Scaffold this active site. Structure first.
Site, PDB file in Angstrom:
ATOM      1  N   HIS B 117       0.899  -1.130   0.000  1.00 19.18           N
ATOM      2  CA  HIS B 117       0.000   0.000   0.000  1.00 19.18           C
ATOM      3  C   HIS B 117       0.977   1.228   0.000  1.00 19.18           C
ATOM      4  O   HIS B 117       2.056   1.112   0.449  1.00 19.18           O
ATOM      5  CB  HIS B 117      -0.856  -0.090   1.267  1.00 19.18           C
ATOM      6  CG  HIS B 117      -1.642   1.132   1.581  1.00 19.18           C
ATOM      7  ND1 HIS B 117      -3.014   1.155   1.583  1.00 19.18           N
ATOM      8  CD2 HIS B 117      -1.247   2.351   1.970  1.00 19.18           C
ATOM      9  CE1 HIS B 117      -3.424   2.350   1.929  1.00 19.18           C
ATOM     10  NE2 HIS B 117      -2.370   3.088   2.168  1.00 19.18           N
ATOM     11  N   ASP B 193       3.298  -4.501   8.094  1.00 17.99           N
ATOM     12  CA  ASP B 193       2.134  -3.680   7.893  1.00 17.99           C
ATOM     13  C   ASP B 193       0.959  -4.625   8.045  1.00 17.99           C
ATOM     14  O   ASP B 193       0.634  -5.309   7.139  1.00 17.99           O
ATOM     15  CB  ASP B 193       2.145  -2.984   6.523  1.00 17.99           C
ATOM     16  CG  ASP B 193       0.840  -2.321   6.165  1.00 17.99           C
ATOM     17  OD1 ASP B 193      -0.071  -2.369   6.957  1.00 17.99           O
ATOM     18  OD2 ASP B 193       0.757  -1.740   5.100  1.00 17.99           O
ATOM     19  N   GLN B 196      -4.375  -4.636   7.203  1.00 14.30           N
ATOM     20  CA  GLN B 196      -5.451  -5.442   6.653  1.00 14.30           C
ATOM     21  C   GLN B 196      -5.695  -6.788   7.351  1.00 14.30           C
ATOM     22  O   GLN B 196      -6.666  -7.396   7.130  1.00 14.30           O
ATOM     23  CB  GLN B 196      -5.267  -5.617   5.139  1.00 14.30           C
ATOM     24  CG  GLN B 196      -6.450  -6.252   4.429  1.00 14.30           C
ATOM     25  CD  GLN B 196      -7.795  -5.549   4.681  1.00 14.30           C
ATOM     26  OE1 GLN B 196      -8.825  -6.182   4.680  1.00 14.30           O
ATOM     27  NE2 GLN B 196      -7.759  -4.256   4.937  1.00 14.30           N
ATOM     28  N   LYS B 219     -10.221  -0.338  10.904  1.00 11.19           N
ATOM     29  CA  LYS B 219     -10.403  -1.417   9.961  1.00 11.19           C
ATOM     30  C   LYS B 219     -10.937  -2.657  10.688  1.00 11.19           C
ATOM     31  O   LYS B 219     -11.888  -2.555  11.379  1.00 11.19           O
ATOM     32  CB  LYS B 219      -9.172  -1.657   9.112  1.00 11.19           C
ATOM     33  CG  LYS B 219      -8.947  -0.516   8.142  1.00 11.19           C
ATOM     34  CD  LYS B 219      -7.602  -0.640   7.491  1.00 11.19           C
ATOM     35  CE  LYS B 219      -7.421   0.384   6.390  1.00 11.19           C
ATOM     36  NZ  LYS B 219      -6.491  -0.106   5.431  1.00 11.19           N
ATOM     37  N   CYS B 359      -4.902   2.712  -3.520  1.00  4.50           N
ATOM     38  CA  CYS B 359      -3.665   3.183  -2.951  1.00  4.50           C
ATOM     39  C   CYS B 359      -2.546   2.147  -3.137  1.00  4.50           C
ATOM     40  O   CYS B 359      -1.658   2.021  -2.347  1.00  4.50           O
ATOM     41  CB  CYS B 359      -3.872   3.719  -1.516  1.00  4.50           C
ATOM     42  SG  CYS B 359      -4.785   5.227  -1.420  1.00  4.50           S
TER      43      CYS B 359
END
Lengths: 402, 400
Positions: B117, B193, B196, B219, B359
């Site tokens: 991302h 990261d 998600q 999220k 993104c």
């Protein structure tokens, strides 16, 4: 966003349940939050919850619209343009972003000037820059009340690269002559940065009147907004100078494995999903403030300060900050001789009076006055003279209790 | 966990589920009423700043803020002091890069994936530009599958490796455990990261070998906006230079200098998002009551039926065909129709989906496409919704 007819403070207190439970005199740390602001946030969360960035779908369209509306509301509140408003988590992030984003403009030996009464958030970032880059960090002279020497400000500001000052001191309550300091900085070609964390929502804060190039404030304080939202005003003239410290999602025009393209302000400065609920809440707070009127807020707070300080003089309890109340905001720092501030605050808490004690993130103030800390009562428009009288009754019993 | 029907009892807490079919969970999740209730309770009942003020309101707010940090730490297998609150994953990632900048020397190497991302790409690109470092990317395919042999080759000699747990554009679940073992074998810093994956599947710092990990409250954890997390393994506490300093990060200050306090306060400048941390903790508690196991199972069902249903309609979809490596994200395209148009039509039928590059421009450029339509789920989404979706997609495709 027009003023309405209302009884102050009664009509404000009606929207804040905690006012029915405690006498909250810790407004400088954070304000109490009115029900309409909580309802505005709840509406986002439960009725139009979505990310912004103009997602094709209806929920994102509504969230984007309200986000944009909030940014316009903040811009209008401080007299800025839409694009000059960036949302951050708080004043502290905003100030650090200024130092990070302007860091590249400094040459070894350049000068930064501030006041000796700054909150740590408006000191540390400049100290680190000075240490890293070999800059001169100078302090305008002032007295123990927080009154700055404007002749010294003129001398100091001449040849400065950047000047950073607080509008109101969180430890003393002094209201600095920011409009004059800003004039001196702009007449001398210095960048002017204003820490408005304690002024915003308590009195007029206008970027044009202040001559501000950068200005920071926190939603959770005066503006009666939520926590986790702050503002950084960046005057358009610095869009070609200021390097965005935080980049990524939402800040670009194009990206490839080899590089990326930054978009235009204000999105160029807002990396990742913003605090959409917080911006909405802040806008709500600002609207709530506007209904009351900053003139009414200033006037109420002055009545509370006047009675508090006069009461404390009747008890022989020393208080800090300016004696000229025209230059004293809704903050009264004090001490009871022979007692540590934390003990005073504890007694007050037993009586359901909420105050703060300590150095208030302003150690250089404490060191300059030769004290370890203070007890601090700070107000908002919802505080009442009745509460001040209860407070003074308690302080009287404390004092007599030796 | 608590006995409850999935997805019905989650849906009962999310009024929007009665109005729309929300398939844009990767952008942000919907928020259950008990999360809003926890935050309202802070605002209306114990509103105050933290940092252990003497007064009772501050004592309560401080207790709840500390409680929230412990809840976050336990959610990812970390210790209390290793959890730093930020505004979002993007800030978290930027902070890593800024805070570790000083350890790099010209010619050191950073490795990442080509599917990142933008928030997990740009900070590394900037660092690499400023300092003259090598930024290399692990090879992989169009589905999102990384070439683990190439990963081995690239990670050797790397100073820092950064990877996404799950792709927001493709839905691929990377072999983060394996990559992290490689990184640690090679003496590289490992950054993850997890934006998600958090709240949709297990995220454990010890299992992932993370030295830094970031995620966003809004999220999968079903928390509010404006709250993110940055995990900093204790080993790096004195190495990581705090990019933001000020109020709350000090032990002492004078006009001529300062000394910082201990973690985690050392890294949290100014009044934190108290409300947001309390909300995030509420979301994590809500997720835990459901159970990550039941979440992952509900999502796999939705993806399976979705991908089968699109196969039937001859609508291409992206990411792994092997569903054990495919998260609750299905990117697709209707041949002969721009993705924004598909999204608009879906919106007409009260189905919320996202369109565009997500993104993740490098993903789109690698695949040779402009963007995609993206349906993404959470545990409150149902198979009935997927059938309604497939019904609208069939009619659409039928308009030959």
């Amino acid at each position: 966003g027009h003023m309405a007819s209302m009884r102050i403070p009664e009509d404000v207190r009606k929207d804040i349940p905690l006012t029915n439970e405690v006498i909250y005199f810790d407004n400088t740390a954070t304000s109490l939050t009115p029900k309409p602001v909580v309802e505005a946030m709840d509406e986002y969360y439960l009725k139009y919850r979505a990310n912004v960035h103009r997602g094709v779908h209806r929920l994102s369209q509504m969230a984007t619209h309200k986000y944009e509306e909030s940014r316009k509301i903040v811009a209008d509140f401080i007299g800025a343009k839409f694009e000059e408003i960036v949302f951050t988590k708080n004043t502290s992030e905003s100030l650090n972003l200024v130092a990070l984003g302007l860091g590249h403009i400094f040459k070894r030996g350049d000068k930064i000037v501030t006041t000796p009464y700054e909150h740590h958030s408006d000191l540390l970032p400049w100290q680190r820059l000075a240490t890293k880059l070999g800059l001169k960090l100078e302090f305008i002279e002032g007295d123990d009340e927080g009154n700055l020497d404007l002749s010294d400000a003129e001398k100091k500001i001449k040849g400065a690269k950047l000047v950073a000052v607080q509008h109101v001191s969180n430890a003393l309550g002094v209201i600095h002559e920011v409009e004059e300091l800003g004039k001196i900085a702009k007449d001398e070609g210095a960048i002017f940065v204003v820490d408005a964390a304690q002024s915003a929502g308590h009195m007029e804060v206008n970027v044009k009147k202040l001559h501000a190039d950068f200005l920071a404030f926190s939603g959770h304080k005066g503006p009666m907004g939520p926590t986790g939202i702050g503002v950084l005003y960046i005057r358009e003239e610095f869009f070609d100078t200021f390097e965005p410290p935080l980049i990524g999602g939402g800040t670009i025009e194009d990206v490839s494995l080899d590089g990326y393209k930054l978009t235009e302000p204000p999105e160029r400065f807002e990396a990742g999903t913003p605090n959409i609920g917080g911006a909405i809440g802040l806008a709500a707070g600002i609207r709530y403030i506007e209904r009351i009127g900053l003139g009414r807020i200033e006037r109420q707070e002055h009545k509370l300060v006047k009675r508090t300080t006069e009461g404390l003089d009747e008890l022989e309890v020393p208080w800090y900050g300016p004696r000229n109340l025209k230059k004293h905001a809704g903050v009264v720092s004090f001490n009871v001789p022979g007692l540590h501030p934390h003990d005073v605050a504890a007694i007050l808490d037993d009586h359901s009076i909420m105050v703060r004690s300590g150095h208030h993130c302003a150690l250089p103030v404490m060191k300059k006055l030769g004290i370890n800390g203070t007890v601090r009562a700070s107000f908002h428009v919802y505080n009442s003279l009745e509460e001040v009288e209860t407070f003074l009754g308690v302080m009287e019993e404390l004092v007599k209790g030796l």
